[PDB]
Symmetry: C2
Subunit: 171 residues, 2 copies
Amino acid sequence: TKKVAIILANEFEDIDYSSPKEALENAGFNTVVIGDTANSEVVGKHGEKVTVDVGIAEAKPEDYDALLIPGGFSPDHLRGDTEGRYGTFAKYFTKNDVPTFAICHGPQILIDTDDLKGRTLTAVLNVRKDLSNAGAHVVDESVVVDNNIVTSRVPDDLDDFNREIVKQLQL
Amino acid sequence: KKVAIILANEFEDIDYSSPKEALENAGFNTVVIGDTANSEVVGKHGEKVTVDVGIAEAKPEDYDALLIPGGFSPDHLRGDTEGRYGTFAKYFTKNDVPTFAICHGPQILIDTDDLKGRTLTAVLNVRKDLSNAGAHVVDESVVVDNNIVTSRVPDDLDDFNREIVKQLQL
C-alpha cells in the first residue's frame, strides 16, 4: 500500500490540506502528517485542527511514496526551522524523483532543496518570483506536471491538482 | 520628512508600532499606504491601523523614505495582482532613497529586482529567497547598505530604530 507524507505547520490553508488528503484517501492511499512534534496540534488559517502523526526528527523519507506540501503560511513556518529540516526532508523527494505535490505557497519549501534549476512549476502569485530566482521555469497554469513534481496555484485549482496527484501515485 | 509605510493585514504589531514611534519621536511624519484609503488593517496580535493613502494614488516621490514592517503583511502585498507594491518600492531602490525593512519586510525588496550585490539581513525564513535574489545575506542585528537598513526580529528593534532615524537626519 502507498502512503503520502504531508508536511504541516500552523496556519496552513485548511482546504489545501483537506481536499488533497480526501482525494488521496479516496483513491486508496494513506496520508501521514509530519510536523515539529508527534501528537502536537497544528491549526489552519480557518481553524481546522490537525494532529501531527510523526515528528520531523524521526521521519524517514524513504518510508513514503510521495510528499504533499499544503499552502497558506505553513510553508513559511516550516522554513523557519533553525536546522532546515523540512528542506532536507523534501530534498529526498526531489533528489530521487519521488512524486512531490505542492499547492499555493507550498512550492516555497522546494526552493530549500536547491534542486529547482530547470524544473517547471507554478505557484500562487506571491511566490512566483522567488521560484524563478531559485532557477525554476515558472508558468501560470492551473496544474503543472514536471516528471514527478505536480504544482497548482490556488484552491480553485484543486480539481485539476487532485486529479493529477492521484495519477502520479498510480505509476 | 515623510515616511511611507506599506501595510497589509497580519503585519507583526511591534514591527509597525516601534519604528513608527521612533520616527515620530525624532520629528518625522509617517503615512500608511495600503489597498484602499481609510480602510483598517489588523496585525497578527490585533493592533488596528488606518490606511491613509491607497496604493493606486500613492506617488513614491512624495516620500523621504519607505518602511516595510514584517509579519505576513509583505506576503499579502506581494499578492497584489498588478504588482503595485513592488513597483512602489522600485522608486526607492532605483533612486537610492532610504529604505527600511524588518523581519519579513525585505521580501518586498525582492520584487524590485534591485538586490543584486546588496547586503541585507532578515528573519531566517526569508534569507534563502534574498540570497537567490542576489543579495549578500548576513546574520546581524542591523545592516546598513547605503540607503537600505534591515534587521531580523523584534529583539533587534533598538538597533533598527537608531539606524533608520540616523538615515533621515541626513
